[PDB]
Amino acid sequence: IKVMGRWSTEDVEVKDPSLKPYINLEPRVHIVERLINKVMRSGGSSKKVRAYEVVKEAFKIIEKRTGKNPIQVLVWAIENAAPREDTTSVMFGGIRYHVAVDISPLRRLDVALRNIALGASAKCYRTKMSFAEALAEEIILAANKDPKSYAYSKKLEIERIAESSR
């Protein structure tokens, strides 16, 4: 019922019609659980409790910085970082080719969450920000469609390559 024993999702809105049916905002596709899994597979040196704590602190930071429900900000970040199409490489002979392909709703989410965790993990490793602060910053940047966001910039890149590979 309560996310990480504190937040509610009943007032969180998914305005992107293409993702709304696949983002689970109901009590026990749980995006928070998915994010934790992505963070768990990144870094920031049980592994699950660790990732859980990093995400929870990141949410507290997001709420303080934006003044909004952290889960809602994550949804915006996901919606902004989820590419609407992708491509598959085919390096045959001496040249690699790009081909635009369908990307499923759940893979769109997985890509966005993976890139958010990757961006956070990268900033953390190289700056004086804790993993939680980097994750909060990455999520906020993505939610605001700010190119400084790794996930968002990656999303633009993927769609750019896909639209050109048609």
Side-chain angles (χ1 to χ4, degrees), residues 141-161:
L141 292 173
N144 292 301
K145 301 188 181 176
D146 185 323
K148 294 182 179 181
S149 161
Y150 173 73
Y152 185 58
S153 64
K154 235 296 182 299
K155 180 274 194 181
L156 294 174
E157 179 185 305
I158 296 172
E159 298 195 330
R160 178 166 57 245
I161 294 176

PDB file of all heavy atoms in Angstrom, residues 141-161:
ATOM      1  N   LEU A 141      16.632  16.075 -13.672  1.00  0.00           N
ATOM      2  CA  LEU A 141      17.042  16.589 -14.976  1.00  0.00           C
ATOM      3  C   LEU A 141      16.193  15.963 -16.080  1.00  0.00           C
ATOM      4  O   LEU A 141      15.696  16.656 -16.977  1.00  0.00           O
ATOM      5  CB  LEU A 141      18.525  16.288 -15.211  1.00  0.00           C
ATOM      6  CG  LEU A 141      19.473  17.063 -14.287  1.00  0.00           C
ATOM      7  CD1 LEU A 141      20.903  16.573 -14.472  1.00  0.00           C
ATOM      8  CD2 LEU A 141      19.371  18.556 -14.588  1.00  0.00           C
ATOM      9  N   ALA A 142      16.025  14.646 -16.005  1.00  0.00           N
ATOM     10  CA  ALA A 142      15.234  13.920 -16.990  1.00  0.00           C
ATOM     11  C   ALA A 142      13.779  14.381 -16.970  1.00  0.00           C
ATOM     12  O   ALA A 142      13.170  14.573 -18.023  1.00  0.00           O
ATOM     13  CB  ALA A 142      15.322  12.418 -16.725  1.00  0.00           C
ATOM     14  N   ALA A 143      13.222  14.564 -15.776  1.00  0.00           N
ATOM     15  CA  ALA A 143      11.836  15.011 -15.643  1.00  0.00           C
ATOM     16  C   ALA A 143      11.651  16.394 -16.263  1.00  0.00           C
ATOM     17  O   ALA A 143      10.551  16.748 -16.688  1.00  0.00           O
ATOM     18  CB  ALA A 143      11.421  15.049 -14.160  1.00  0.00           C
ATOM     19  N   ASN A 144      12.724  17.176 -16.303  1.00  0.00           N
ATOM     20  CA  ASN A 144      12.665  18.519 -16.874  1.00  0.00           C
ATOM     21  C   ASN A 144      13.159  18.595 -18.319  1.00  0.00           C
ATOM     22  O   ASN A 144      13.325  19.688 -18.858  1.00  0.00           O
ATOM     23  CB  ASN A 144      13.483  19.488 -16.020  1.00  0.00           C
ATOM     24  CG  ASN A 144      12.867  19.718 -14.658  1.00  0.00           C
ATOM     25  OD1 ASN A 144      11.726  20.169 -14.548  1.00  0.00           O
ATOM     26  ND2 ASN A 144      13.618  19.409 -13.611  1.00  0.00           N
ATOM     27  N   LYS A 145      13.386  17.441 -18.941  1.00  0.00           N
ATOM     28  CA  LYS A 145      13.877  17.395 -20.315  1.00  0.00           C
ATOM     29  C   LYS A 145      15.129  18.252 -20.452  1.00  0.00           C
ATOM     30  O   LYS A 145      15.248  19.056 -21.376  1.00  0.00           O
ATOM     31  CB  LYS A 145      12.813  17.892 -21.301  1.00  0.00           C
ATOM     32  CG  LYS A 145      11.520  17.096 -21.276  1.00  0.00           C
ATOM     33  CD  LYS A 145      10.598  17.522 -22.403  1.00  0.00           C
ATOM     34  CE  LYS A 145       9.293  16.750 -22.360  1.00  0.00           C
ATOM     35  NZ  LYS A 145       8.350  17.228 -23.406  1.00  0.00           N
ATOM     36  N   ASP A 146      16.057  18.078 -19.521  1.00  0.00           N
ATOM     37  CA  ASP A 146      17.302  18.827 -19.541  1.00  0.00           C
ATOM     38  C   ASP A 146      18.385  17.930 -20.130  1.00  0.00           C
ATOM     39  O   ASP A 146      18.643  16.839 -19.623  1.00  0.00           O
ATOM     40  CB  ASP A 146      17.665  19.267 -18.121  1.00  0.00           C
ATOM     41  CG  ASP A 146      18.890  20.166 -18.077  1.00  0.00           C
ATOM     42  OD1 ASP A 146      19.839  19.935 -18.858  1.00  0.00           O
ATOM     43  OD2 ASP A 146      18.906  21.100 -17.247  1.00  0.00           O
ATOM     44  N   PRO A 147      19.027  18.377 -21.224  1.00  0.00           N
ATOM     45  CA  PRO A 147      20.082  17.597 -21.876  1.00  0.00           C
ATOM     46  C   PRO A 147      21.221  17.192 -20.951  1.00  0.00           C
ATOM     47  O   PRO A 147      21.970  16.260 -21.251  1.00  0.00           O
ATOM     48  CB  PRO A 147      20.540  18.513 -23.015  1.00  0.00           C
ATOM     49  CG  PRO A 147      20.222  19.882 -22.506  1.00  0.00           C
ATOM     50  CD  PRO A 147      18.864  19.683 -21.883  1.00  0.00           C
ATOM     51  N   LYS A 148      21.355  17.885 -19.826  1.00  0.00           N
ATOM     52  CA  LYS A 148      22.408  17.543 -18.879  1.00  0.00           C
ATOM     53  C   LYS A 148      22.130  16.136 -18.367  1.00  0.00           C
ATOM     54  O   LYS A 148      23.023  15.448 -17.874  1.00  0.00           O
ATOM     55  CB  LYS A 148      22.439  18.546 -17.721  1.00  0.00           C
ATOM     56  CG  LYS A 148      22.845  19.953 -18.152  1.00  0.00           C
ATOM     57  CD  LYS A 148      22.910  20.921 -16.977  1.00  0.00           C
ATOM     58  CE  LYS A 148      23.341  22.312 -17.438  1.00  0.00           C
ATOM     59  NZ  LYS A 148      23.448  23.285 -16.310  1.00  0.00           N
ATOM     60  N   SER A 149      20.877  15.708 -18.498  1.00  0.00           N
ATOM     61  CA  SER A 149      20.479  14.371 -18.068  1.00  0.00           C
ATOM     62  C   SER A 149      21.009  13.345 -19.049  1.00  0.00           C
ATOM     63  O   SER A 149      20.776  13.457 -20.256  1.00  0.00           O
ATOM     64  CB  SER A 149      18.956  14.248 -18.014  1.00  0.00           C
ATOM     65  OG  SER A 149      18.566  12.883 -18.029  1.00  0.00           O
ATOM     66  N   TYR A 150      21.713  12.344 -18.531  1.00  0.00           N
ATOM     67  CA  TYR A 150      22.254  11.279 -19.360  1.00  0.00           C
ATOM     68  C   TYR A 150      21.109  10.508 -20.012  1.00  0.00           C
ATOM     69  O   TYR A 150      21.106  10.286 -21.223  1.00  0.00           O
ATOM     70  CB  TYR A 150      23.079  10.309 -18.519  1.00  0.00           C
ATOM     71  CG  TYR A 150      23.528   9.088 -19.290  1.00  0.00           C
ATOM     72  CD1 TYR A 150      24.536   9.178 -20.248  1.00  0.00           C
ATOM     73  CD2 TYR A 150      22.928   7.845 -19.076  1.00  0.00           C
ATOM     74  CE1 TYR A 150      24.941   8.059 -20.977  1.00  0.00           C
ATOM     75  CE2 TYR A 150      23.323   6.720 -19.796  1.00  0.00           C
ATOM     76  CZ  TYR A 150      24.330   6.834 -20.745  1.00  0.00           C
ATOM     77  OH  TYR A 150      24.738   5.726 -21.450  1.00  0.00           O
ATOM     78  N   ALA A 151      20.139  10.101 -19.198  1.00  0.00           N
ATOM     79  CA  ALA A 151      18.993   9.338 -19.695  1.00  0.00           C
ATOM     80  C   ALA A 151      18.234  10.085 -20.780  1.00  0.00           C
ATOM     81  O   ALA A 151      17.905   9.514 -21.824  1.00  0.00           O
ATOM     82  CB  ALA A 151      18.049   8.997 -18.548  1.00  0.00           C
ATOM     83  N   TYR A 152      17.956  11.361 -20.544  1.00  0.00           N
ATOM     84  CA  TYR A 152      17.226  12.146 -21.526  1.00  0.00           C
ATOM     85  C   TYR A 152      18.020  12.335 -22.817  1.00  0.00           C
ATOM     86  O   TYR A 152      17.471  12.196 -23.909  1.00  0.00           O
ATOM     87  CB  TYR A 152      16.838  13.518 -20.964  1.00  0.00           C
ATOM     88  CG  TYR A 152      15.968  14.317 -21.914  1.00  0.00           C
ATOM     89  CD1 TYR A 152      14.746  13.810 -22.359  1.00  0.00           C
ATOM     90  CD2 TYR A 152      16.379  15.561 -22.392  1.00  0.00           C
ATOM     91  CE1 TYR A 152      13.955  14.516 -23.258  1.00  0.00           C
ATOM     92  CE2 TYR A 152      15.597  16.278 -23.295  1.00  0.00           C
ATOM     93  CZ  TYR A 152      14.387  15.747 -23.722  1.00  0.00           C
ATOM     94  OH  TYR A 152      13.613  16.442 -24.616  1.00  0.00           O
ATOM     95  N   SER A 153      19.306  12.650 -22.694  1.00  0.00           N
ATOM     96  CA  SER A 153      20.144  12.856 -23.871  1.00  0.00           C
ATOM     97  C   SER A 153      20.281  11.546 -24.641  1.00  0.00           C
ATOM     98  O   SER A 153      20.330  11.541 -25.869  1.00  0.00           O
ATOM     99  CB  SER A 153      21.525  13.384 -23.465  1.00  0.00           C
ATOM    100  OG  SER A 153      22.223  12.428 -22.683  1.00  0.00           O
ATOM    101  N   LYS A 154      20.333  10.433 -23.916  1.00  0.00           N
ATOM    102  CA  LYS A 154      20.440   9.127 -24.550  1.00  0.00           C
ATOM    103  C   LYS A 154      19.156   8.859 -25.334  1.00  0.00           C
ATOM    104  O   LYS A 154      19.190   8.339 -26.448  1.00  0.00           O
ATOM    105  CB  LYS A 154      20.640   8.043 -23.494  1.00  0.00           C
ATOM    106  CG  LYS A 154      21.864   7.179 -23.712  1.00  0.00           C
ATOM    107  CD  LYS A 154      21.756   6.378 -24.994  1.00  0.00           C
ATOM    108  CE  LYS A 154      22.962   5.474 -25.175  1.00  0.00           C
ATOM    109  NZ  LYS A 154      24.225   6.255 -25.260  1.00  0.00           N
ATOM    110  N   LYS A 155      18.025   9.230 -24.742  1.00  0.00           N
ATOM    111  CA  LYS A 155      16.721   9.050 -25.365  1.00  0.00           C
ATOM    112  C   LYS A 155      16.655   9.823 -26.681  1.00  0.00           C
ATOM    113  O   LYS A 155      16.163   9.312 -27.688  1.00  0.00           O
ATOM    114  CB  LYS A 155      15.624   9.536 -24.413  1.00  0.00           C
ATOM    115  CG  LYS A 155      14.196   9.407 -24.925  1.00  0.00           C
ATOM    116  CD  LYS A 155      13.779  10.610 -25.763  1.00  0.00           C
ATOM    117  CE  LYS A 155      12.276  10.623 -25.978  1.00  0.00           C
ATOM    118  NZ  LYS A 155      11.848  11.776 -26.813  1.00  0.00           N
ATOM    119  N   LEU A 156      17.143  11.059 -26.667  1.00  0.00           N
ATOM    120  CA  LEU A 156      17.146  11.883 -27.874  1.00  0.00           C
ATOM    121  C   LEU A 156      18.032  11.247 -28.943  1.00  0.00           C
ATOM    122  O   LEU A 156      17.677  11.208 -30.119  1.00  0.00           O
ATOM    123  CB  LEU A 156      17.655  13.291 -27.548  1.00  0.00           C
ATOM    124  CG  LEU A 156      16.753  14.097 -26.614  1.00  0.00           C
ATOM    125  CD1 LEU A 156      17.431  15.408 -26.246  1.00  0.00           C
ATOM    126  CD2 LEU A 156      15.422  14.356 -27.293  1.00  0.00           C
ATOM    127  N   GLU A 157      19.188  10.750 -28.519  1.00  0.00           N
ATOM    128  CA  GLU A 157      20.143  10.105 -29.414  1.00  0.00           C
ATOM    129  C   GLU A 157      19.530   8.881 -30.100  1.00  0.00           C
ATOM    130  O   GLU A 157      19.599   8.736 -31.324  1.00  0.00           O
ATOM    131  CB  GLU A 157      21.376   9.680 -28.619  1.00  0.00           C
ATOM    132  CG  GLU A 157      22.448   8.967 -29.423  1.00  0.00           C
ATOM    133  CD  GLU A 157      23.582   8.482 -28.539  1.00  0.00           C
ATOM    134  OE1 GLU A 157      24.166   9.310 -27.809  1.00  0.00           O
ATOM    135  OE2 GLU A 157      23.892   7.273 -28.565  1.00  0.00           O
ATOM    136  N   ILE A 158      18.935   8.001 -29.301  1.00  0.00           N
ATOM    137  CA  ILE A 158      18.318   6.797 -29.834  1.00  0.00           C
ATOM    138  C   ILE A 158      17.254   7.122 -30.880  1.00  0.00           C
ATOM    139  O   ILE A 158      17.252   6.535 -31.962  1.00  0.00           O
ATOM    140  CB  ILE A 158      17.678   5.945 -28.702  1.00  0.00           C
ATOM    141  CG1 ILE A 158      18.763   5.449 -27.745  1.00  0.00           C
ATOM    142  CG2 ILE A 158      16.937   4.750 -29.297  1.00  0.00           C
ATOM    143  CD1 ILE A 158      18.218   4.766 -26.505  1.00  0.00           C
ATOM    144  N   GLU A 159      16.358   8.056 -30.569  1.00  0.00           N
ATOM    145  CA  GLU A 159      15.298   8.412 -31.507  1.00  0.00           C
ATOM    146  C   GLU A 159      15.854   9.093 -32.757  1.00  0.00           C
ATOM    147  O   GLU A 159      15.325   8.916 -33.856  1.00  0.00           O
ATOM    148  CB  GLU A 159      14.256   9.320 -30.836  1.00  0.00           C
ATOM    149  CG  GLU A 159      13.524   8.680 -29.643  1.00  0.00           C
ATOM    150  CD  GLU A 159      12.276   9.448 -29.243  1.00  0.00           C
ATOM    151  OE1 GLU A 159      12.247  10.678 -29.437  1.00  0.00           O
ATOM    152  OE2 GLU A 159      11.323   8.829 -28.723  1.00  0.00           O
ATOM    153  N   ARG A 160      16.916   9.871 -32.580  1.00  0.00           N
ATOM    154  CA  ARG A 160      17.550  10.568 -33.691  1.00  0.00           C
ATOM    155  C   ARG A 160      18.087   9.525 -34.674  1.00  0.00           C
ATOM    156  O   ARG A 160      17.806   9.586 -35.871  1.00  0.00           O
ATOM    157  CB  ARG A 160      18.682  11.459 -33.168  1.00  0.00           C
ATOM    158  CG  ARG A 160      19.466  12.208 -34.236  1.00  0.00           C
ATOM    159  CD  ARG A 160      20.329  13.310 -33.619  1.00  0.00           C
ATOM    160  NE  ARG A 160      21.265  12.814 -32.610  1.00  0.00           N
ATOM    161  CZ  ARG A 160      21.215  13.123 -31.311  1.00  0.00           C
ATOM    162  NH1 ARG A 160      20.267  13.928 -30.844  1.00  0.00           N
ATOM    163  NH2 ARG A 160      22.127  12.638 -30.478  1.00  0.00           N
ATOM    164  N   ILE A 161      18.840   8.561 -34.158  1.00  0.00           N
ATOM    165  CA  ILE A 161      19.393   7.496 -34.984  1.00  0.00           C
ATOM    166  C   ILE A 161      18.287   6.656 -35.629  1.00  0.00           C
ATOM    167  O   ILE A 161      18.390   6.283 -36.798  1.00  0.00           O
ATOM    168  CB  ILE A 161      20.311   6.568 -34.152  1.00  0.00           C
ATOM    169  CG1 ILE A 161      21.542   7.346 -33.682  1.00  0.00           C
ATOM    170  CG2 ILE A 161      20.729   5.350 -34.980  1.00  0.00           C
ATOM    171  CD1 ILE A 161      22.463   6.556 -32.770  1.00  0.00           C
TER     172      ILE A 161
END
